[PDB]
Ligand binder design. Structure first.
Ligand SMILES: C[S@@+](CC[C@H](N)C(=O)[O-])C[C@H]1O[C@@H](n2cnc3c(N)ncnc32)[C@H](O)[C@@H]1O
Ligand SMILES: [Zn+2]
Ligand SMILES: [Zn+2]
Ligand SMILES: [Zn+2]
Length: 423
């Protein structure tokens, strides 16, 4: 018996609403993707199938583009990779955009695969395209994606009889723009992109009552507030460390809507996240484009070098509640963890704790995972009372945001037991 149902909203299209009263942490829906792929920067770093990182991956012998963690993953992926393999081969070294690889997998799934459980509430055919709101600039970009797809797929798809019936590639890419999910690993690093059409019913709120988390490609949807019968379910489509102006731009450009929620009407938290000298944080915001590019390609030593130049700059510095400074601290912490600089990771991580408390209110998975990382660093440095406090706080958050069905909760229970045994 489902706890959620599709419905027609008054002014934001279709949505999901509660059928029964819901409590924080209640699992509402789980879904494998209709289709998904690894992202450009993680290609060859994480397994194409399970999206777990490894130091040595096995490559597909035919295309040598797909890479895997194990014979099992390579073999189990073969059906969903067989047709794209021919295309990826006849395209080296021109790798397609992620959206193109994703739509290719959509096409092969719809043509050759049984009806997907991911479409139980809403199908790819049903997805919102916002075509009558797209600017001419966006339509031109979509037309180039269509021709890129036609080029990439030419060996497996030659005509419309190889596409689903009444399948329009322009409309399909318009759907991908506003319904793609970025897949994050347990450490909240971006590793893939997928379509989850039933989950695509969720409309956006800058102060949402639900949250999603990923366990590999698997998606869990949970309540994070009390929800009444008939109340619409919402998730935040956006990173929380964004001003109302930045949210406005992305919600317009990618999702074609204007938000008039309370936070956007009052510029909630904007002033606090832009504290410090403007000339300084404009420069950090610029540097973060390069830092985040390097992080997306797992270039940890280069990330840390750039972050240290900011955090320990000889010139003027920013408060840790400035969102660009905060993102630099978080990148430096993650770089230090992956480089084994655990004392330095803890220094940066602990500085993010109070800003994360302010900017991730309630139960948010990103805060839960950050707190867990800090507790884990304190546990391995022997700071047991501090570690236990943070590990318990991470559990208080992640019991709501992640739940028993997420494997990270089992990892956290083991840390809590080890730290409790030390105490
Ligand atoms: C992932 S889909 C959500 C389901 C969609 N309403 C539908 O009918 O299929 C995202 C699209 O929903 C609409 N949308 C989502 N959240 C909204 C909101 N808070 N206000 C107005 N429109 C919203 C926009 O059209 C957006 O591009
Ligand atoms: Zn794998
Ligand atoms: Zn292959
Ligand atoms: Zn808003």
């Amino acid at each position: 018996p489902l706890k959620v149902e599709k419905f027609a909203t008054a002014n934001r299209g279709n949505g999901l609403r509660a059928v029964t009263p819901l409590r924080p942490g209640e699992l509402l829906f789980r879904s494998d993707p209709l289709a998904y792929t690894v992202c450009k920067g993680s290609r060859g770093v994480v397994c194409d199938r399970c999206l777990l990182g490894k130091e040595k991956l096995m490559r597909c012998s035919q295309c040598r583009v797909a890479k895997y963690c194990s014979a099992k993953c390579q073999k189990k992926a073969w059906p969903d990779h067989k047709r794209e393999c021919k295309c990826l081969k006849s395209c080296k070294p021109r790798y397609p955009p992620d959206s193109v690889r994703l739509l290719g997998r959509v096409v092969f799934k719809l043509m050759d695969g049984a009806p997907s459980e991911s479409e139980k509430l809403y199908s790819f055919y049903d997805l919102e395209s916002n075509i009558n709101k797209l600017t001419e600039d966006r339509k031109e970009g979509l037309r180039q994606l269509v021709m890129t797809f036609q080029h990439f797929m030419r060996e497996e798809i030659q005509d419309a009889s190889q596409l689903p019936p009444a399948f329009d590639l322009f409309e399909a890419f318009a759907k991908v723009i506003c319904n793609s999910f970025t897949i994050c690993n347990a450490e909240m690093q971006e590793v893939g992109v997928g379509l989850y059409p039933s989950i695509s019913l969720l409309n956006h709120s800058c102060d949402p009552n639900c949250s999603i988390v990923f366990n590999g490609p698997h998606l869990l949807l949970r309540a994070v507030r009390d929800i009444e019968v008939g109340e619409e379910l919402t998730i935040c489509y956006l990173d929380m460390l964004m001003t109302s102006e930045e949210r406005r731009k992305q919600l317009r450009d990618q999702y074609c809507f204007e938000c008039d929620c309370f936070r956007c009407q009052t510029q909630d938290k904007d002033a606090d996240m832009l504290t410090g000298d403007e000339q300084v944080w404009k420069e950090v915001q610029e540097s973060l484009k390069k830092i985040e590019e390097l992080k997306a390609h797992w270039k940890w030593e280069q990330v840390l070098a750039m972050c240290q130049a900011i955090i320990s700059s000889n010139s003027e510095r920013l408060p840790d509640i400035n969102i660009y400074q905060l993102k630099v601290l978080d990148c430096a912490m993650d770089a230090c963890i992956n480089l084994g600089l655990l004392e330095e990771a803890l220094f940066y991580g602990t500085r993010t704790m109070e800003p994360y408390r302010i900017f991730f209110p309630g139960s948010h998975p990103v805060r839960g995972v950050q707190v867990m990382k800090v507790g884990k660093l304190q546990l391995h440095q022997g700071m047991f009372p501090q570690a236990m406090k943070n590990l318990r706080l991470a559990f208080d958050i992640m019991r709501v945001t992640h739940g028993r069905e997420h494997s990270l909760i089992e990892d956290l229970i083991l840390l809590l037991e080890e730290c409790d045994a030390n105490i």
